[PDB]
Every structure is written in structure tokens, then in C-alpha cells.
Amino acid sequence: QFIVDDVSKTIKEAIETTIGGNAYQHDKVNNWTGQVVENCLTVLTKEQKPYKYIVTAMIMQKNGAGLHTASSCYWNNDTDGSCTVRWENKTMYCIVSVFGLAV
Amino acid sequence: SQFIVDDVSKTIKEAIETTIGGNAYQHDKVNNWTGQVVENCLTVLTKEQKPYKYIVTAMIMQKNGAGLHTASSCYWNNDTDGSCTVRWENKTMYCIVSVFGLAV
Amino acid sequence: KAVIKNADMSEEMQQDAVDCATQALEKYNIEKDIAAYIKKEFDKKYNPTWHCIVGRNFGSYVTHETRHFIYFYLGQVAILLFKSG
Amino acid sequence: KAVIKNADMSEEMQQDAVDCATQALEKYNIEKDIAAYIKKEFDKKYNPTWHCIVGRNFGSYVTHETRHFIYFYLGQVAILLFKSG
Amino acid sequence: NLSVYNVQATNIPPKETLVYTKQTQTT
Amino acid sequence: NLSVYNVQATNIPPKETLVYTKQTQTT
């Protein structure tokens, strides 16, 4: 069972980690991004279930440029499962997704 | 079979250059572009008939001076599985496409 | 003692316009320093970028953002103030 | 007969702003119309978003972007012109 | 078995805050 | 059987055009 509602919270907890309550600037950004992906990974491999996991996290200064994504994927449409969540402040749109798959 | 990294990046490229090759950024269109780009590879690496599962993403960001930042780790078997990212600028938008190749 | 001449914005923001103007008026003697006072004060509170012009006989053609423009008299001093960029 | 008090920008632009304003200052007699003419002309050429003040008594705190600012007299009439946003 | 999926989704275009153009003169 | 594997990180640093402030008084 890919508990999507539960793995929902897991991602929203990748804001109670790093500077998910500060603000954005250039020279210190690539510290966060990588780390957000890292910590959300450990807490489903610790669970060692029969899943694999892909997980991406994206960050774009709130300048007024347009942003558009695409989520075409191809898997076991009953056991495999996706979770994407969105969070923003006044500085930055932030956007994260994770993919669990079978065997 | 397995996951030839070139036989995806050459396959991505065509997609990119097909959909958004020869036009600048425009809101009324973008999302249908990304929609194609991705539902275009998929139509190609499934014809391919490999024992694989796939995930395929597209970014398109306007060039306006905003600051974008990518990060992507995974949890597969490094020997059976692999993934390809591809980056594509014009004048009015950057663009990033990333297909992943998990085995059954 | 204010006379509003032309207003876009905000009542509440309208106020801090007059309010902190009234302050520059009595703090500073020179038109330029008045301007600088009101600009910065508004850059700070209401976020960049603002522009202040203060004088007695000047004319003006400017572009502002909706609901971020005001031009008013204090005594007989013209005060213009708007956000753009 | 034009004195440049402070400039950022740009020989050609500069001298284009100068020679323009003079036109302005012979067609139009009202201070607010002189500004109009210059502001409009520049949005045409050099792209929005420009702002103009034209006055005998005024001071200014303003924020512009690079090589897009000019402040000169025509006799007594002072022109402030800059780009922002 | 193996199939295709969505497509969620995200899409956030620009906004460029509006702007007006007003002119003033002094008495 | 399986373990983590490498990030794929790519970033386009902002820029944010420049701007100066200016002050000017008439006579």
C-alpha cells in the first residue's frame, strides 16, 4: 500500500527542516534544494519497503516569470504511486514531488 | 534490455526541438507544450517495448531574471536503472526534460 | 491641513502618505530632504520602489502601479509620490 | 543654452533627451505638458517605463536603472527624466 | 498492468502588476 | 539489493537588474 495521504505529510515535513521559514537569496540556495531531497528520501528507505523512489524538488525566485511542469509516467497503476505538493512564501514558489514504484 | 542513455537524450532532443523549436514564450500555449513534450517521449520509449517503467518530466521557465534550482536524487538499483536529463535554452525561456528508467 | 489633489491608493496608505509627509515638512527645510524622507519611509514600509517629488511649481507625467500613487498639498508645498519598478 | 547638472547616460541618449526637451519647450507652454511630450517620446524610442518632471521649484528622491537618468536646466526650467520599471 | 498517468500538473504564469499613467501640475 | 544514487542538480542563478538612487534640488 502506497500510503499517499501519509507520505503527503512526509513532504510537508521537508519545510520544518531547512530554511523553510526564512527567505531566498542566490549564494546559499543550492544548499537547501539538495537537502530537501535528501531527508525526504531517508524516511522511506528506513522503512525498507518493496518500493523504489524518485524525488525531485524545484525552486524559483518569485520574480514574475512563468513556470510549467509535466507529470507523464508509466507504471503499475495500482501499487505504484505519486505524491506532489506545493508550498510558497513571499520570496519563492517551491514545488516537490516523489515517485514510488514496485518490486 | 537495459537503459541506453544516448538512446534517450537523442530521443528527448527531437521532442524538445519538435514542440518548442521555432517559437518564443507565450502563456496561452506553454502548458500544452510541456503536455506534448512528455506525452511524446512516452509514445516513443513504449513503442520501444522494454521491460522498464518510466517517469518523464518537463520544465519550461520564461527568461525574465528569476532564479531556478534543480535537485533530483533517487533510490533505484544503479546497475539496472538509469535516467537522462536535458537542457535547452532559447531567448525567451529555458527548459529542462528528465526521463527516468526503472526496471520491473 | 492637507489638500489631496489626486489619489490612487489606499485610504490607510493614503494616510501614511499625508501622515509621514506632515513629518518631513517639519523635520526638514529643503525640498530635496523632504522627498528623501518620504521615499525611504515608503520603500521601507510598502516595499520598493517609490519616488517622491516635492516643490512649489513643478509639472509631472509619470507611470505608477495601480493603487500606489498620490499627489497632494501640504500648506502650499506640492507632494508627489508613487511606485514604479 | 542647456546646462547638464547630473547625468547617467550616455552621450547620444543624453543629447537626444536634451534636443527633444527643447522642442517640448517651444510647442508647449504649460509645465505639465512639457513633461508629457518628453515622457511619451521616450517610451516610443527607448522603451517604457520613463518618468518626467519639469519645474522651477522642486526637489526629488528617485530610483532609476543604469545609464537611464538625466537632470538638466533649460535656462531656468529644470528637467528630471529617468527610467524605472 | 503498466499504464500512463497524470499530469498533475502545475502551472503558474506571470502577472506583471498592472500600472496607470497619471500627470499632475502645480498652481 | 538497492541503495541511493546520485543527485542531478542544475541551476540558473538569478541576476536582478541594477538600480541607482538620485537626489536633486532646483534653485
Cα-based distances in Å from E18 to A10, A13, B14, C62, C64: 38, 36, 38, 14, 9
H/E segment holding residue A14: none
Instruction: Using alpha carbons, list the distances in angstroms from residue C16 to C12, C29, C38, C42, E23.
Output: 7, 20, 9, 9, 22
Resolution of the coordinates, Å: 3.5
Q: Would the CB atoms of E26 and D55 count as touching at under 8 Å?
A: yes
Give all domains of chain B, ordered by start, each with its CATH number: 5-104 (3.30.1140.40)
Helix (H) or strand (E) run with residue C19 in it: helix C12-27
Residue B94 main-chain phi, psi, to 5 deg: -80, 180
* B85 contacts F11? CB cut-off 8 A: no
Chain F residues with CB-CB distance to A32 below 8 A: none
AA identity, residue B9:
S
DSSP strands (E only) in D10-65: 50-64
List, in sequence order, every residue forming a beta bridge with B60; answer none if it has no partner: A68, B95
Q: Which of D27, C1, D45, A101 is nearest to B53 (CA)?
A: A101
- Distance from C-alpha of B76 to C-alpha of B52, rounded to nearest angstrom: 12
Residue type at D21 in one-letter notation: A
Q: Is A63 on the interface with B (CB under 8 A)?
A: yes
Residue type, A1: Q
And the C-alpha cell for C11?
485610504
CB contact under 8 A, A26 and F2: no
- Angle CA(E13)–CA(A86)–CA(B97) in degrees, nearest 5? 65
Homologous superfamily, domain C1-85: Protein Inhibitor Of Neuronal Nitric Oxide Synthase; (3.30.740.10)
Chain D residues with CB-CB distance to C53 below 8 A: 53, 58-60, 62, 80
List the Cα angle A44/A99/A15 in 5-degree steps. Answer: 65
The whole-angstrom separation of Cα C6 and Cα C11 is 12
Contacts of B65 in chain A (CB under 8 A): 63, 65
Q: Residue D62 and residue C53: Cα distance in Å, rounded?
A: 8
Select from C20, C44, C60, C65 the residue whose CB has the most chain D CBs within 10 Å, as the one to mutate to test that interface.
C60
**Dihedral sign of CA atoms D13, D14, D15, D20 in order:** positive
Q: Are strands A92-101 and B82-87 parallel, antiparallel or unpaired?
A: unpaired
d(CA D74, CA F25): 15
Q: Containing H/E element for B1?
A: none
In a 3-state reduction of DSSP, which class is residue C7?
A: strand
| CB-based contact A66 B98, cutoff 8 Å | no
* Cα D40 to Cα D47: distance, rounded to the nearest angstrom: 10
d(CA B104, CA B56): 17
Helix (H, G, I), strand (E, B) or coil at D9: coil
CB burial of residue D61 (10 Å; 0-12, 13-18, 19+): buried
Please give the single-letter amino acid code of residue A35: Q
- Locate A38 and state its grid cell: 535528501
Yes or no: say if A29 and A92 are a contact pair by the CB < 8 Å rule. no
Within 8 A of B59 by CB-CB distance, chain F residues are none
Strand partners, C2: C74
CB within 8 A of A8, min separation 6: which ones?
A: A83, A85
CA distance C30 to D58: 9
User: Shortest CB distance from D60 goes to which of C49, C53, C61?
Assistant: C53
Q: How was this structure determined?
A: X-ray
D26 by DSSP, 3-state: which?
helix
